[model samples]
Target: HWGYGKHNGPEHWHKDFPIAKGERQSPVDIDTHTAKYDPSLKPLSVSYDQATSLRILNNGHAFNVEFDDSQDKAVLKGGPLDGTYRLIQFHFHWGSLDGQGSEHTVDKKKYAAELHLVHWNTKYGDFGKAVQQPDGLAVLGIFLKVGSAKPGLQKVVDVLDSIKTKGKSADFTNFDPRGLLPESLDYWTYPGSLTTPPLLECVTWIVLKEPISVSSEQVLKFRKLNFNGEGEPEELMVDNWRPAQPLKNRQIKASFK
Candidate 1:
């Protein structure tokens, strides 16, 4: 029912999905100066097996690396979550132009890109049902810097050529998403909604303090993707990001001092 275009973008999302205007909406700005340190917050624990990876798909919105979470091959616990959250899928949000794209910002500073590893709380059954309730989703937000080469993402970038068009997918496996993360587990936490439509107020966001580097050449491949289909006038798929929403009464919690 909505998209990231001027006519149906973030600004007009609320007209259809009223939850877009909710107080706990996501992609919030992270002002380090005001973030409070939480000594009680435990270190995050993430475990993933490469065999659990399923495939990669361009779902008309963003390219996603899906996983099979039927068992405990990939799981996230510790930190602010009450139970184990199963890793479902991971994807990216980028731009048509350089210097800006990330949904969340640091001190109002944006990044070249952002990678999201989406996980759902197992205590609530499945991801579709879990998304409707508060505290049902845990999204790990990793900022991407433009400069050095990212050897970690070689497997992901290698498959972009196949999934350039919407509804396209390829068999992908033996790629553990755990490699996409940085060494430092230090992060910021808050209660917010999904950045997309349906915009449920369920995600418990955990934004990593560190930013990973990706070369400019690698990012160029992302812009090569198309928003349309095989036989249609293709619109370049870029700048597919939701602008940061109002923080309202939310408090940003820091895991480290």
Candidate 2:
């Protein structure tokens, strides 16, 4: 199976998932100098209901907080989207240390971590079908930097111990992820794929230019999460992030100057 370990990491992913070499792959290095500014782009609209949050689990890859998407109670629209997209789940990617966790980089610079709020286009009926379409998914990406402790992130981290091993889960309710967003929604938009496999080329990535603050202590807590399941040799779940892919000929546009 695909993993972040040397034998099964990004480099080896192409062997099983050949599309790993496909165009429009994600987490490309964002060159601000080349990212065209588009005044025509509207501000993104994100309205998430905290009550929709259901549970958090370590899916053997990343810890994901899933939402109740049976209704349009939580949605994301506007900006680069053609229609409304329902929030399905949100997860994070981090490194063993504070220097290199984010999948996306700016001018080849890495951040401490990255947050992905996964959504599916309602027009596509559902995520399963949406994943097959070109414009069927939108992932809001936020970079996390080391600094003052973030109270919002603290809520998620507090529950990490309960889900220390792979496949463990716990009730994670009424948690508003909006608090995790950077104040400015100013972002760079582009067509890309999921940072990890199945590596579908279906995402409209909205990567925020500004980063949110997270203390070193908080990052330390994240490193303690285990990739191994109970009764198995423990392995720390760090560096669970894909390195930036080639930008190719895709145009990266910015909503700000």
Candidate 3:
């Protein structure tokens, strides 16, 4: 039973995906006020590849991009960030154009959307196995807002036509995702879990406080995606975001001095 719709939203995820019971779910209501400040925790390296190295796949539910980490460069060091992690996959969560779309909340305020850059520890073998470990995964969360045009995302938006239909994907050759990174790389780090079902609690989350901007038209394109299989009546794929989960005593730290 794949819980991928409104009826089977996060609240009902554990019912079908039993493993979700022990998972450390994220997109929680972060208490930014309590966030600890430490600048030394910044990432060690930040790389970008605008080539066609990124491959988009129709994942049955959403469009998932298999990032070519082998060609990209990203590193983090100091404090809790001591190892090098490679980019694996990137995806997004959104809401109906008329409603809320953010996955994680800051004091309960949701944004237009959220993007996840999934990574895995090189020490733990491949990303597939690393994702299963308690400390094998790291994700960078970027919040997106609708209104006022933002050209930074034009490259990605330009390719929507190639994957406009469900079960369709494009090579996205030479596409560089680093250009999508918000102005500030500073973020809040914590141990968390996948926001989706089979909610593995093995992810190290880095949620950027700074948000990226996108045009209303671009936001509409994202919501138009269909989670249903091909030929099925396209159910608007908006509001794919899971509501904020309980912090469960987890402490969120920041990479700011």
Best by lDDT: 2
Candidate 3 — worst ten consecutive residues by lDDT sum?
44-53
Mark the 10 consecutive residues where model 2 has the least summed lDDT. Answer: 42-51
Q: What are the lDDT scores of the predictions, listed in order?
A: 0.89, 0.92, 0.73
Once superposed on the true structure, which residue ranges of model 3 sit more than 4 Å away at CA?
A: 39-44, 49-52, 71-79
RMSD of each: 1.1, 0.9, 2.4
Compose the digit string of candidate 3's lDDT tens values, residues 1-257.
46457577677887776756553677688778888886556453555443234677655556677766664365433336567677777888777863488889887888888888777788877877887888888788898888676675676677766676567888865666776688887788888988886688878888888988888898888776666667787777777777887677778888775
Whole-structure CA lDDT of model 2: 0.92
* Model 2: CA > 4 A from native: none
How many steric overlaps does candidate 1 have? Answer: 2
Per-candidate TM-score against the hidden true structure? 0.97, 0.98, 0.89
- Tens digits of per-residue lDDT, candidate 1, 135-253, equal 89999999988888788798888899999898999988778787788889999999998899888999999999998888898888888998887888988889989988899999999
Q: After superposition, how far is residue 97 of candidate 3 from its true place, in Å?
A: 2.9
> Model 2, 121-164: lDDT tens per residue?
99888789999999989999999999999998899999999999
What's the lDDT for candidate 1? Answer: 0.89
Give the lDDT of residue 49 in candidate 3: 42
